[PDB]
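Hi support team,

I'm opening this ticket because the web form for multi-chain structure prediction keeps timing out on my end. I have pasted the exact lines I submitted so you can reproduce it. The total is 94 residues across two entries, so I didn't expect it to be a heavy job. Is there a limit I'm missing, or should I split the entries? Thanks in advance, R.K.
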Amino acid sequence: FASVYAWNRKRISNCVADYSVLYNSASFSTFKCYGVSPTKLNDLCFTNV
Amino acid sequence: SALGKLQDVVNQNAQALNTLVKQLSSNFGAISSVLNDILSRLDPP
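Hello R.K., no limit was hit. The queue was backed up. Here is the completed structure from your submission:
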């Protein structure tokens, strides 16, 4: 994991994104979405990640 | 083979209906202008 002033960016594309293996996973300390609701992410489609 | 006093009424009314139609695409300070894109990616609260 890089540091805060040289953070690393990975672009995600060309795949189904299952946040179901992430949202029903109780292993993170903060999961804060802005502009979306973390329970409706499997009904949308996105251009990039 | 003149009628501008009648064409003025037609034009003013069409010009008002066009503005009413076109105001349906302003956000008024929301995230989207279309209601279904607020309903689809947001929850009731």
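A quick check on our side: Chain A has one helix and no strands. Let us know if the file doesn't open in your viewer.
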